Amino acid sequence: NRGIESPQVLEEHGISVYASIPLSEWQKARDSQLLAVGNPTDLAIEAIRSLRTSLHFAMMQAQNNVLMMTGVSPSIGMTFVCANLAAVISQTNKRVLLIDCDMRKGYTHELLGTNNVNGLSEILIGQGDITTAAKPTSIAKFDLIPRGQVPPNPSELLMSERFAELVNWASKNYDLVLIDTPPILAVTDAAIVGRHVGTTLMVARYAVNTLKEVETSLSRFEQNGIPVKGVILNSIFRRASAYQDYGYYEYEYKSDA
Amino acid sequence: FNRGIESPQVLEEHGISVYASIPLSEWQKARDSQSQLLAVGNPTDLAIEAIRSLRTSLHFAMMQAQNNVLMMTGVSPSIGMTFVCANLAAVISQTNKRVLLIDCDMRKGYTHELLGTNNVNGLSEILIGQGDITTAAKPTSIAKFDLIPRGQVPPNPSELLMSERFAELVNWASKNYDLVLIDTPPILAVTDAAIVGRHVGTTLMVARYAVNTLKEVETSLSRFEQNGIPVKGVILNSIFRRASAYQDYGYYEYEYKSD
Amino acid sequence: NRGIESPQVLEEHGISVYASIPLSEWQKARDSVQSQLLAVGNPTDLAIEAIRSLRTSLHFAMMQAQNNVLMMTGVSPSIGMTFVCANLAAVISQTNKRVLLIDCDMRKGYTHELLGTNNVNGLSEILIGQGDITTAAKPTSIAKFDLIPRGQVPPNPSELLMSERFAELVNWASKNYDLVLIDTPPILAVTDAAIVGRHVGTTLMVARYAVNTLKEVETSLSRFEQNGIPVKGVILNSIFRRASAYQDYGYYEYEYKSDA
Amino acid sequence: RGIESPQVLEEHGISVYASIPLSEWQKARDSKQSQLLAVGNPTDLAIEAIRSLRTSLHFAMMQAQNNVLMMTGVSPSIGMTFVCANLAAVISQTNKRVLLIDCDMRKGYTHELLGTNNVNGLSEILIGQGDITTAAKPTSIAKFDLIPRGQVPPNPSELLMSERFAELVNWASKNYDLVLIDTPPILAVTDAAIVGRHVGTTLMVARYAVNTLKEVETSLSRFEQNGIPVKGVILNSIFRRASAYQDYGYYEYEYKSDA
Amino acid sequence: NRGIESPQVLEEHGISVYASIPLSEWQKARDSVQSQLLAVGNPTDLAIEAIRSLRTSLHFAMMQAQNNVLMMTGVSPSIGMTFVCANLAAVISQTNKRVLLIDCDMRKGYTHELLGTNNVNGLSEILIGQGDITTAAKPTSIAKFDLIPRGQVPPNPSELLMSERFAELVNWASKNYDLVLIDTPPILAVTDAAIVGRHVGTTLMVARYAVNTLKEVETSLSRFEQNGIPVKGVILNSIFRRASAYQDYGYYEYEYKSDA
Amino acid sequence: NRGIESPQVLEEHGISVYASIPLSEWQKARDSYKQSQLLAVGNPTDLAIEAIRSLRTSLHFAMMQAQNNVLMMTGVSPSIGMTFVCANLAAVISQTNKRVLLIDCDMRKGYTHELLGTNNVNGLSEILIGQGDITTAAKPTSIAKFDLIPRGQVPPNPSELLMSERFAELVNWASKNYDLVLIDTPPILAVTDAAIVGRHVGTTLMVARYAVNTLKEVETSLSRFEQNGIPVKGVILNSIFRRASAYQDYGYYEYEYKSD
Amino acid sequence: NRGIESPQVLEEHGISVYASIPLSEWQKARDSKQSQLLAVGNPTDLAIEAIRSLRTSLHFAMMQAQNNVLMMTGVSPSIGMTFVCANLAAVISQTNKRVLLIDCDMRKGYTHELLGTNNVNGLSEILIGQGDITTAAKPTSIAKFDLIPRGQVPPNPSELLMSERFAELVNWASKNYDLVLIDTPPILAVTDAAIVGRHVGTTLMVARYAVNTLKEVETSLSRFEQNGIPVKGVILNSIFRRASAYQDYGYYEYEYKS
Numbered sequence A: 001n002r003g004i005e006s007p008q009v010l011e012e013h014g015i016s017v018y019a020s021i022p023l024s025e026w027q028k029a030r031d032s033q034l035l036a037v038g039n040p041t042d043l044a045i046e047a048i049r050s051l052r053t054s055l056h057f058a059m060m061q062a063q064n065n066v067l068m069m070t071g072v073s074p075s076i077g078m079t080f081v082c083a084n085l086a087a088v089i090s091q092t093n094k095r096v097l098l099i100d101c102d103m104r105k106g107y108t109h110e111l112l113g114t115n116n117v118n119g120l121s122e123i124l125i126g127q128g129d130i131t132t133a134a135k136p137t138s139i140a141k142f143d144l145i146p147r148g149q150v151p152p153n154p155s156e157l158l159m160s161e162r163f164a165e166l167v168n169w170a171s172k173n174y175d176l177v178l179i180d181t182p183p184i185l186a187v188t189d190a191a192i193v194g195r196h197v198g199t200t201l202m203v204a205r206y207a208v209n210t211l212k213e214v215e216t217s218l219s220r221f222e223q224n225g226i227p228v229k230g231v232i233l234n235s236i237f238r239r240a241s242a243y244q245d246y247g248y249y250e251y252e253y254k255s256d257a
Numbered sequence B: 001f002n003r004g005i006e007s008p009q010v011l012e013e014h015g016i017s018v019y020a021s022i023p024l025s026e027w028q029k030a031r032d033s034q035s036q037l038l039a040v041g042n043p044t045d046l047a048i049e050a051i052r053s054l055r056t057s058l059h060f061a062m063m064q065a066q067n068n069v070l071m072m073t074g075v076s077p078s079i080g081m082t083f084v085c086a087n088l089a090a091v092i093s094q095t096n097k098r099v100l101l102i103d104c105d106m107r108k109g110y111t112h113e114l115l116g117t118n119n120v121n122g123l124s125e126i127l128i129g130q131g132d133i134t135t136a137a138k139p140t141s142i143a144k145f146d147l148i149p150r151g152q153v154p155p156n157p158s159e160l161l162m163s164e165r166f167a168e169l170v171n172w173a174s175k176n177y178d179l180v181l182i183d184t185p186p187i188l189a190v191t192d193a194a195i196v197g198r199h200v201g202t203t204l205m206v207a208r209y210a211v212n213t214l215k216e217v218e219t220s221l222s223r224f225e226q227n228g229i230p231v232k233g234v235i236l237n238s239i240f241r242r243a244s245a246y247q248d249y250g251y252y253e254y255e256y257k258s259d
Numbered sequence C, E: 001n002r003g004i005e006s007p008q009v010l011e012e013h014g015i016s017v018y019a020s021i022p023l024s025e026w027q028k029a030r031d032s033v034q035s036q037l038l039a040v041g042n043p044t045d046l047a048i049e050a051i052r053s054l055r056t057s058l059h060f061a062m063m064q065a066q067n068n069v070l071m072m073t074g075v076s077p078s079i080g081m082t083f084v085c086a087n088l089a090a091v092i093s094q095t096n097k098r099v100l101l102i103d104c105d106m107r108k109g110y111t112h113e114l115l116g117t118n119n120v121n122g123l124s125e126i127l128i129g130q131g132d133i134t135t136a137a138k139p140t141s142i143a144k145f146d147l148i149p150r151g152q153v154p155p156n157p158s159e160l161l162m163s164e165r166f167a168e169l170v171n172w173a174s175k176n177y178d179l180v181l182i183d184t185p186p187i188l189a190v191t192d193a194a195i196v197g198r199h200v201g202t203t204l205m206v207a208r209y210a211v212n213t214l215k216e217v218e219t220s221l222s223r224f225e226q227n228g229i230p231v232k233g234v235i236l237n238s239i240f241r242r243a244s245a246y247q248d249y250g251y252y253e254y255e256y257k258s259d260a
Numbered sequence D: 001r002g003i004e005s006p007q008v009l010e011e012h013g014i015s016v017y018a019s020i021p022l023s024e025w026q027k028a029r030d031s032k033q034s035q036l037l038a039v040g041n042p043t044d045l046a047i048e049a050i051r052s053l054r055t056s057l058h059f060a061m062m063q064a065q066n067n068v069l070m071m072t073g074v075s076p077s078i079g080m081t082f083v084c085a086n087l088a089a090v091i092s093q094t095n096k097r098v099l100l101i102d103c104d105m106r107k108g109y110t111h112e113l114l115g116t117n118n119v120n121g122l123s124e125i126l127i128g129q130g131d132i133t134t135a136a137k138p139t140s141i142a143k144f145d146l147i148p149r150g151q152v153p154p155n156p157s158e159l160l161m162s163e164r165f166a167e168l169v170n171w172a173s174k175n176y177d178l179v180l181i182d183t184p185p186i187l188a189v190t191d192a193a194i195v196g197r198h199v200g201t202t203l204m205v206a207r208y209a210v211n212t213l214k215e216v217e218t219s220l221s222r223f224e225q226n227g228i229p230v231k232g233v234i235l236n237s238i239f240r241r242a243s244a245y246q247d248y249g250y251y252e253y254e255y256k257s258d259a
Numbered sequence F: 001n002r003g004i005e006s007p008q009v010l011e012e013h014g015i016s017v018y019a020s021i022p023l024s025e026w027q028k029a030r031d032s033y034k035q036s037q038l039l040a041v042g043n044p045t046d047l048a049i050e051a052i053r054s055l056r057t058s059l060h061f062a063m064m065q066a067q068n069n070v071l072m073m074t075g076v077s078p079s080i081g082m083t084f085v086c087a088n089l090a091a092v093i094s095q096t097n098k099r100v101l102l103i104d105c106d107m108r109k110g111y112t113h114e115l116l117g118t119n120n121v122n123g124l125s126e127i128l129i130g131q132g133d134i135t136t137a138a139k140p141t142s143i144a145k146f147d148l149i150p151r152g153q154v155p156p157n158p159s160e161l162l163m164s165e166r167f168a169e170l171v172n173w174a175s176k177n178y179d180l181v182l183i184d185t186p187p188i189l190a191v192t193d194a195a196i197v198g199r200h201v202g203t204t205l206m207v208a209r210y211a212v213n214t215l216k217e218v219e220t221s222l223s224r225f226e227q228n229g230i231p232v233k234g235v236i237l238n239s240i241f242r243r244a245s246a247y248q249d250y251g252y253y254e255y256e257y258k259s260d
Numbered sequence G: 001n002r003g004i005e006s007p008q009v010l011e012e013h014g015i016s017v018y019a020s021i022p023l024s025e026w027q028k029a030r031d032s033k034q035s036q037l038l039a040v041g042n043p044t045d046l047a048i049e050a051i052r053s054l055r056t057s058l059h060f061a062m063m064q065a066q067n068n069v070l071m072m073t074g075v076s077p078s079i080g081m082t083f084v085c086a087n088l089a090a091v092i093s094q095t096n097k098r099v100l101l102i103d104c105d106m107r108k109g110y111t112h113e114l115l116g117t118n119n120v121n122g123l124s125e126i127l128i129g130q131g132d133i134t135t136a137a138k139p140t141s142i143a144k145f146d147l148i149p150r151g152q153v154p155p156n157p158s159e160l161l162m163s164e165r166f167a168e169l170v171n172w173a174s175k176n177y178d179l180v181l182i183d184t185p186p187i188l189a190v191t192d193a194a195i196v197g198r199h200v201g202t203t204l205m206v207a208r209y210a211v212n213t214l215k216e217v218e219t220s221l222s223r224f225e226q227n228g229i230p231v232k233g234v235i236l237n238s239i240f241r242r243a244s245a246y247q248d249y250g251y252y253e254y255e256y257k258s
């Protein structure tokens, strides 16, 4: 039980790997901005496009257009996968709303070219109407409700009836609703949010998160009655390149002119 | 084994569900070197964040359990069942819920000292007849959080809990509050908890990290089963890290400091 | 199979351990001088606290049984079945219930000496036809706790318990009282307990800690099972602490002394 | 080899109904009995064991819905007459009218042992020279009657085969509280298997370190072959080997009464 | 395998041993000069006591089957199937019952010699044409014991038993007698017994101790089941002990001397 | 793991191999990258074409159990022969006097228009955007009852175009207007495209290259489909070659049945 | 799996061996493609006696099926499926039954040659549309035995068998004849048999002794089941003796003449 080296490791333990997102060297370079826009040919984006296809089917089964993105631990890319997925879904001619439920460390507004004025934090206490809430981002058909000002009681705010009101509104007013949450192993927040969502997906970093960590995470959700559809393996990289193997294998399918 | 529980997995594999894993707070242990309530004193604390996780687990667990009364019992003395209990009720009140804590430890109980309440006409006096059930509840330094302290130490604690006056009080509390939390003495020390357990809808057991043994936990659970008291799970209190690369081998606790 | 060292030993064999009574050093001191109840003399004692635990599990098991008569029998002599019996009745009386103890040990019974009563018109006299069943019960030094002592030692104890006059007394005792406790001689010594067991609703058996063997316990139970008397469980008396890491091994005992 | 424990038989699906110790008083007062131990030494552990057998018997007969009991043994001189006579004696002491029929028309001596004449006994009754009602003779023990063997016939097995035998047992059953039939050993003569057809409960005696498990199994086979159910086995003449804290198979406690 | 050494050997393989007849030294002596029949000559003999045990087993087995006809067969020749048969009938007549023995061994058969009867108009004659089924039975030296001897040796014994005249005789015998015993030749030598077996209600098989093998016994039982003839059990004849002990293995002889 | 060396390898893992296409030495020669010409036309006697004829026979039965005349041809990885198998299959199906339409859904690297002899004007790309009517779409190829809708001009959003309701409608039209519809798609392990297309098809078949694709690769591919509710009928093993010639054995065996 | 040397090998793998045809030394000698039909040339031959056993097995096997059409297919080429087929039909006609043999091997068929028939207007032609069904049938050198030969080699045999005209012919043949036998090319070489199999009531597979292996039989049955064609069993052709003993091992045969 070390850092997950293969999607098969968790697949064999009855944990379905919904997507295996490679490490984008373009993003890695820029970090030292939205990739779906910056470099749309990227294998990470092509993997997120696969995730969108898997989701469409998985959400027709759930019949609820709300989806939660949670992670195992902090800084594994759950905000990266979430923002880029919403971006890719909007490109399918669908009105997408992203709710940044990370009222502790959320920075969607910054990443999506939006102000943090009258965000989720404000909406939840009362100050700020639910209908007005949504803010347009640098991407067409993609709107965002940022975290708002950092509250002293994030978990307690999500516990309110005002949160269920907002999610219900969002569900009615948008084609798809994505909720970015803080990691389950750090704070309870995601479990609280999970009560209102129809589909839950969990991010795990490639050679970093352990099978025990993943199992513990999924346990916390079950314990609170939240079904998790599957796991997303982010920041995967090639090791033993053979004829593309080690469980990963990804092909450069470059279009013609 | 017959050695201190080193992992939640140890008791999970033996068919004992670990509902929460509370870390050892240094703020408490240092500001105790029991003193100040952590949930108020230091609300950012990892122990409080873990207790908030327990609150989330509880909400779901009792919906099916059906009875807003919850009992908190422990394996042995000084493991932190009063700490978990008081701090849980504090965190539940912060959810805009009417929380009543009943201190059933009429032997060593001190919740009234913790929560800033007098011990006049407590459980002891209100169980002997000396006080009225409706008047009983006392407001604490925390909003939406009320307490019925132990009262004066009686010569017959187990015998008082055995009375019909106890069932009357719990029934009242259930009707008058959103949630009822009952702090009891450890099961392995005194029978008290097994008497109280008859009136509760959900029972949770605290066990200290590298201190309580699997045999101790197994024995405790047996005493409850023997008295027809179902235990929903176990809470692992005072957990500490033993590693330092990709948090943290057997147990993991991440600090997600707000901006 | 050598002295029982753990409740788990017999637990694993199907034998339910209902209570594990520690060795009271207070009682040990007061004997080395039985005489005078421990439940009264030193009520804070761990043995009494263990006895209180037994009362709690008792309440449940007897509600299920549908009868208020409970027999206390042992495996062998001098294991503490009279000790557990008298102290349990004492502790049950403290629960605000009208409780009666019948001393069915017409051979070596001495409850009358323990509880402070005369032996006049004792069980012996009642069974022969001399004394009236309604008058029988005698008040003890403990409130809401009554006793029918053994009487003068008869030549035919087993034969007296075999009479219809015994069933009549137990029947009366069951009516009139909230709980009926019957102290009997050990099953492995004399047949007496197996005769008494026909009239009872819940049967409990005492076994001494590092003294009685699993084979002894199994044999005891087989005698009852052969006479159609179901035994609810076993009580492990005179348990003593051996280890000192995480309190103990087997049964760990905590000294929960009250505040102010 | 000789059955060293009750557990040996019990593990082979043979229930041990009682374990009668060796009577130190009876061996002394033999050095064919002829004193009944139940009378001469009533405190004896062998009798206390026979009293336990009486307790097992009632209930096992007040569930069989029959008052007739047969006592048979594996081999000669194991104590089946000893257990039988002493058991009847102990049952009569329970204020019950007991009849003992001595079906050992070969070597029977109950009349010598219980102080009765052998005039117009079982032998005579079956030949058709003596009335079934008149039959019963009072013994030296109150409420205890006996039908002795009578004069030794040339055809014992043939006489028990008669309808006169079934008539007598039926009469005995109607008149008396309990009917005990002492018979010769099954492994020696067929007699017991003939008698067994009229009894409601059958018990088999086996001598402690003498009779073998094979002998017991063979005996039980002969009965089931003749449709006679055997309720259990009685281990007679048991002795203590090493002291320890009661030892190997059997257990003995000297619970002597006060003055 | 080997000559059977224990009744348990048979019983282990599922073969019920109905009786274990010891070797009669009295017979052995009166043959080394059969004889003037053991049941009469020496009635106290252990062999006769064993045959009496067989009679007790039979009474239950036959009145359980509701048919008074019994066949006695054997595994191989000269094992004592005629010895066990004649002596059993003798012992059954002593129970005040009218017994008829039919000698179905029409090749070798010698009961009329042993029971002092003439061989005029025997089974052979009855089966061919006439001798009159009703007249057939002849009185033996033993009261309540009648015999139909083999008759003159026919050239077709198996063929005669195959006739409807045989079934007629057995049916008559069943109606006119309390018990019918049919002595047959060994199954492993001739088919005769399997033909006779169709008309009988109970079948018993004799096997010589230390001589007949388990394979022989199994083969014999197979031939019967192949012909739908149920065999109750096996009789172990000519048993002897291999020096005392506790009496073991399998065989135990207890002399139970009458005294007057 | 290592490249699949036997159809049995997959078969033992519960993956039904539907066809085992040999390596066309004729095709390998004419190629010298991309497929030079249609082998079904170029060399119709070729063992690869005979194997594709076997696939057609398997399909006829399998397609009609499904009731839907639309079939998708997807592969594990690029350059394994899924376009080769697809085009050649449709060619051999048209030879069965059936109206076949091939839709090249590879709007990234598609070249069916080059291979079949068609212009790329107003292709799938254009149709999906609006720049073409669905009912005009189909283009006749160099082969008889065989029509093709080529990729069209390379769009910047291929997966997004297949996601449209305009795609669903084209497939529905094609199904109504043709005897059967074959859809060539890009590899599943490279791009999501095939999983989008799979929603509209009635039968899905997957190509895997002989000693190249691994069992892990095949299992991963099949997982992606089931995750999107796309049932895969089986796997096609393309480019199989011999190592032996003993009795033709060691996984695969193919016979040179030359006509007279 | 090193070339079936026993009927038991197959039997143990749940594949029923319907017949075990020995190697005819008369035929082996006459062949130095089969020269002429053995059931006529040497009727006493053990191979023909084995084929008579196969006829007895089929009678029962075909009552079960209800359809009088039977297909003979093989694992690989030159194993004797044409030999078994022609000789079986010959032996069935000798049971005074009207037998029709259809040569579905439009690739390498030669039944017209060995049976003494012209190849004018064969199956190839009939399928093409030119040539009437009711005329198709040609009498052979054997009484009650008719044949419809392959015709001239077509460029599309698998495609011709795929036609509705084939189903029409089989249906006619069934309605008119007592028994219909269809000789096909090997399943492991060409798809032809799997196409034909849809119209037949009973399918039997030939496998050569010492040759053909167990994996070949396995993959041969697999291909049929994949196309919903039930195979009743396997025929082991060209079996030969190994020992010169006193009776055994896999096979054992006796010369039962006067």
Ligand SMILES: Nc1ncnc2c1ncn2[C@@H]1O[C@H](COP(=O)(O)OP(=O)(O)O)[C@@H](O)[C@H]1O
Binding pocket: A021, A022, A023, A024, A025, A027, A028, A031, A044, A071, A073, A074, A075, A076, A077, A078, A079, A080, A081, A234, A235, A236
């Ligand atoms: N697949 C990836 N390839 C390259 N960089 C990545 C990838 N996933 C995440 N990152 C980077 O990792 C960092 C943390 O990602 P983030 O979405 O903020 O994590 P989290 O939501 O878990 O707190 C960012 O700088 C992000 O660009």
Ligand SMILES: Nc1ncnc2c1ncn2[C@@H]1O[C@H](COP(=O)(O)OP(=O)(O)O)[C@@H](O)[C@H]1O
Binding pocket: B022, B023, B024, B025, B026, B028, B029, B032, B034, B035, B047, B074, B076, B077, B078, B079, B080, B081, B082, B083, B084, B237, B238, B239
């Ligand atoms: N998770 C924790 N971190 C730090 N100190 C703790 C923790 N839990 C309990 N304690 C400390 O343990 C001591 C006793 O706790 P208490 O609640 O009185 O135990 P109990 O009721 O189980 O007898 C106090 O010093 C309390 O602050």
Ligand SMILES: Nc1ncnc2c1ncn2[C@@H]1O[C@H](COP(=O)(O)OP(=O)(O)O)[C@@H](O)[C@H]1O
Binding pocket: C021, C022, C023, C024, C025, C027, C028, C031, C034, C047, C074, C076, C077, C078, C079, C080, C081, C082, C083, C084, C237, C238, C239
């Ligand atoms: N748990 C105990 N601790 C101390 N002394 C005990 C305990 N149990 C029994 N004893 C002592 O053991 C002795 C015998 O007990 P008793 O009740 O008379 O036994 P029994 O009825 O089984 O013959 C008494 O002196 C009693 O005080």
Ligand SMILES: Nc1ncnc2c1ncn2[C@@H]1O[C@H](COP(=O)(O)OP(=O)(O)O)[C@@H](O)[C@H]1O
Binding pocket: D020, D021, D022, D023, D024, D026, D027, D030, D032, D033, D046, D073, D075, D076, D077, D078, D079, D080, D081, D082, D083, D236, D237, D238
């Ligand atoms: N438990 C016993 N203790 C002492 N002597 C015994 C015991 N059982 C039997 N005996 C003696 O054994 C002898 C034979 O007993 P008996 O009843 O006559 O045997 P059986 O009926 O088997 O013939 C007698 O002398 C009897 O007193």
Ligand SMILES: Nc1ncnc2c1ncn2[C@@H]1O[C@H](COP(=O)(O)OP(=O)(O)O)[C@@H](O)[C@H]1O
Binding pocket: E021, E022, E023, E024, E025, E027, E028, E031, E034, E035, E047, E074, E076, E077, E078, E079, E080, E081, E082, E083, E084, E237, E238, E239
């Ligand atoms: N148990 C026995 N003891 C002594 N002799 C016996 C015994 N059984 C049989 N015999 C003798 O064996 C001989 C053959 O017996 P028999 O009944 O004639 O055998 P079978 O009917 O098998 O031919 C006779 O002389 C008989 O007396």
Ligand SMILES: Nc1ncnc2c1ncn2[C@@H]1O[C@H](COP(=O)(O)OP(=O)(O)O)[C@@H](O)[C@H]1O
Binding pocket: F021, F022, F023, F024, F025, F027, F028, F031, F033, F034, F035, F036, F048, F075, F077, F078, F079, F080, F081, F082, F083, F084, F085, F238, F239, F240
């Ligand atoms: N069985 C085969 N035998 C010979 N060449 C083949 C075979 N299968 C595929 N090829 C060749 O492989 C190359 C790639 O095939 P292609 O159909 O374009 O693959 P894909 O669509 O999987 O990317 C072409 O040159 C094709 O002719």
Ligand SMILES: Nc1ncnc2c1ncn2[C@@H]1O[C@H](COP(=O)(O)OP(=O)(O)O)[C@@H](O)[C@H]1O
Binding pocket: G021, G022, G023, G024, G025, G027, G028, G031, G033, G034, G035, G047, G074, G076, G077, G078, G079, G080, G081, G082, G083, G084, G237, G238, G239
């Ligand atoms: N059992 C046999 N004994 C001797 N020769 C045989 C046997 N079976 C087949 N042959 C010969 O071997 C060849 C097998 O080819 P054939 O019967 O035409 O069928 P196919 O080639 O279709 O498998 C023929 O030449 C035939 O004479």
Ligand SMILES: [Ca+2]
Binding pocket: A078, A079, A102, A106, A181, A182
């Ligand atoms: Ca984040």
Ligand SMILES: [Ca+2]
Binding pocket: B081, B082, B105, B108, B109, B184, B185
């Ligand atoms: Ca406490």
Ligand SMILES: [Ca+2]
Binding pocket: C081, C082, C105, C109, C183, C184, C185
């Ligand atoms: Ca006592």
Ligand SMILES: [Ca+2]
Binding pocket: D080, D081, D104, D108, D183, D184
């Ligand atoms: Ca006797």
Ligand SMILES: [Ca+2]
Binding pocket: E081, E082, E105, E109, E184, E185
């Ligand atoms: Ca004979």
Ligand SMILES: [Ca+2]
Binding pocket: F082, F083, F106, F184, F185, F186
């Ligand atoms: Ca392609």
Ligand SMILES: [Ca+2]
Binding pocket: G081, G082, G105, G109, G183, G184, G185
């Ligand atoms: Ca051919």
